[PDB]
Design a protein around this ligand. Sequence first.
Ligand SMILES: [Cl-]
Ligand SMILES: [Cs+]
Ligand SMILES: [Cs+]
Length: 107
Amino acid sequence: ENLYFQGAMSIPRSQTTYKKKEGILTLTEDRKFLIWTPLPATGPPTVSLALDNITNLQQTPPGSAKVILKFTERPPPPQYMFQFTHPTDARAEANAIRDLLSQLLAA
Ligand SMILES: [Cl-]
Ligand SMILES: [Cs+]
Ligand SMILES: [Cs+]
């Protein structure tokens, strides 16, 4: 039917490295930007990517040496790689933020 729904669960926050620095990958509260902020995550984000401007999302396949999500932005287009570093939960974290993003992007 005609009902439209939006996500209403807590926005995932993920232990990730960007350009070899440790930080947190999340979305803004309005769910319009992907943000990455270096630890201690006191200050502003160093990466802020509008979901409107993401043209692709790729991942390392499960069982790869590294768990990595790769974002391509609208313009050799700009690209961003985030390595998921949680000792046990890396792939689950990647999957979660992937799943949210792909739901947002396909809407
Ligand atoms: Cl994996
Ligand atoms: Cs988490
Ligand atoms: Cs792995």
